[PDB]
Amino acid sequence: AKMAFTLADRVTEEMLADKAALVVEVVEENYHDAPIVGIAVVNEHGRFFLRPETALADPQFVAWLGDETKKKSMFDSKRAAVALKWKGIELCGVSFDLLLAAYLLDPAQGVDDVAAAAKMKQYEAVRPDEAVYGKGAKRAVPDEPVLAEHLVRKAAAIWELERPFLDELRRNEQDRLLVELEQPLSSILAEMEFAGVKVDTKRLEQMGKELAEQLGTVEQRIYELAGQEFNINSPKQLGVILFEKLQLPVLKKTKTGYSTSADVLEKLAPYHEIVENILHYRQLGKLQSTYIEGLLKVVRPATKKVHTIFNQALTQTGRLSSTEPNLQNIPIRLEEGRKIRQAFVPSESDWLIFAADYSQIELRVLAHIAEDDNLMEAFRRDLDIHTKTAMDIFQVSEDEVTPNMRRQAKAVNFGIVYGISDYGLAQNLNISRKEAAEFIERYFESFPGVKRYMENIVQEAKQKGYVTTLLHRRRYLPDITSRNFNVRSFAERMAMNTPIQGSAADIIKKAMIDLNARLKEERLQAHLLLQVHDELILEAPKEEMERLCRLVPEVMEQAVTLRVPLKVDYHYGSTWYDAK
DNA sequence: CCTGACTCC
DNA sequence: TGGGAGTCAGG
C-alpha cells in the first residue's frame, strides 16, 4: 500500500505512450450522458491522474485517446467508450479488457469491479469501488486525493494483471474468444447503445391512454365477479380471494403462500370465469407499468431515443442482457402487447426497420453437437422439426399430425433442450403425466444421439468440472456431484443446456462482427440497433432493403459452419411492429 | 429490500 | 418436477 503517482495539472508527453493501462471513471451505473469524474494512466514511465476538464479539453490527449496505434488496457472499456461518445470523443486502441477477460475465465464470479478481478490472481493492492464510493443514498465521489489514488490503483492493477489473465485464457484456449470475438463485439455494442432507438411518443402516449380505460373496465369486472374490491396486483390478497373466498382448489403453494402463477390460474378456468379476467388484467397492467410508463420515463425527450445498456459480462451462458430499459423483452406473443412495437421507429425519415431471426438455432446446435443422424437429416431436408417429432412420438404419418399433435411435439422439442421432466411437460401441456412420460421416452428412442449427448455431457461435467461451447466458452459446475438430488439435478440440466444456449450465443456474436465488417466494407448506411438472443434488428434507408435482404441472412447463416444448415428469416417495415 | 407477477429468447 | 434474462408493484 505504497503507490507513488503524479497528480498532474496538465497533460505531458510521457503520459501518451503507445501502451498504457487507462481508467476513464464513470461512477453512475447508467453511463449514458454521464459525467467522467477522473482519469488515470499507468505506463512504462509512471503513474498519472488527470482531471477530465483538463484532459478531455487537451487536443493532445484527445488525439491519443482516438489513436488506434496507442494501445490501452482497461476494465469495462464499453462504459468509457460510450461516456466519451456523449462528450464527443472517440476511444480507439483498446487491446485488453479485464472485465471481459475475467468474465470468460469464470462467469460465476460475477466480477463487476477491478478488485474482484484482481482477487482471481490474489492481487489486493486495490479497493472495491463500493468501498470508495459507498452505497445507495451514501454514494458519492470522494475528495480528489482519495479518488485519484483509487483510479491510479485500478490502472496499476490492470497493468499488472493483463499478462496473468491472458496467460490463463491462452492455457484455456480462450485467448482468441477474448481478442477476436468479445473485445470487437464490445465496440459494436458501444455503437448500438449510443445510437439508440427512436420512439414514437405520441403513439405510445395514445396507447397508454386507451390502456388505462381498458384496465379500469377489466378491473371493475373483476370486482363484480369477486363480489368485493381488492388489490389484484397483490398475489397475497388475490390468493385470499381465490382460495378462501371463492374456495377454488389450491394447486400449488410457494414459500410465502398460495401460488397465483399464470400456469395455476389457467388450470382454474373450469372453476370460475374470474381467473381469465385476472390474467388479462395482470397482462394489461404490465403493459401500462413497464412498456408505456417505464419506457416513457427513459426516453431522452429532445431526440426521442432510448439508449439501452447491453451487459456483456453478466449471463452464465454467454448471452447478453439488456437494461434501463430492457429492449430484449418487448412484447410480441399477444396482439395486445405486440402493438407496443409500433412505437419503435427509424431514427430518420424514409428509413425502415429490418429484423432478421435464426430459425430454431438451439435445435440445430443440438443436432450438430449430438451428431444425431435422424435430427441432422431432418434439418438437411428442412423438414418441419415439430411435425417430424410429432410423427415419431404419436407414431403417425405426416398427413395425420393434427395441429394439436404438433403443438405437443413443439413443447417436447423445446423442453428437451431445458431437460424438462414428465411432470413439467404434463403441466406445460396440461396433459396426462403418463402420456407426457411416454412422449419423452419416445423422443429419446427416435433421437438416440440426443439421448447419448445428454448422458455424455453430464459425464463430461462430472469429470472436468465444467462444460464448453463451440467457441470455447466455459461454465463451471461445481455442484454437479452434490449428493442432494435437487442441487445435483439442476447442475445436470445446466450441463445439458449450456453448450446449446452458449454456442447459439457464440454464433450470433460472431455474426454481428461479420455483419458490421460487411456493412462498412460496402459503405452502407444501415446499422445494428438491437440483438435479442437469436435476432438482429437494424435500421437503414429504404433504398438499402434489397441489399440487406440478401446480405444479412447470408452473413448470419455463414457465421459458423455446422453439420446442419443455419436458416435465417427476415422482414422489414415502417416500425418494429411492421417488420414481420 | 425480497417475492412473485409479467415480458422476452 | 424447465435452460437464460429484467422490471415492476406490493409488502
From TrEMBL:
The EC number of this protein is 2.7.7.7
Positions of Mg(2+) 3 binding: 358, 534
Binding residues annotated for Mg(2+) 1, in chain numbering? 357-358, 534
| Residue window of the full protein shown | 299 to 878 of 878
* UniProt: dCTP 2 binding residues: 319, 360-362, 386, 406, 410, 414
**Name of this protein:** DNA polymerase I
Q: Which UniProt keywords apply?
A: DNA damage, DNA repair, DNA replication, DNA-binding, DNA-directed DNA polymerase, Exonuclease, Hydrolase, Metal-binding, Nuclease, Nucleotide-binding, Nucleotidyltransferase, Transferase
Domain 3'-5' exonuclease, by residue range, is 4-170
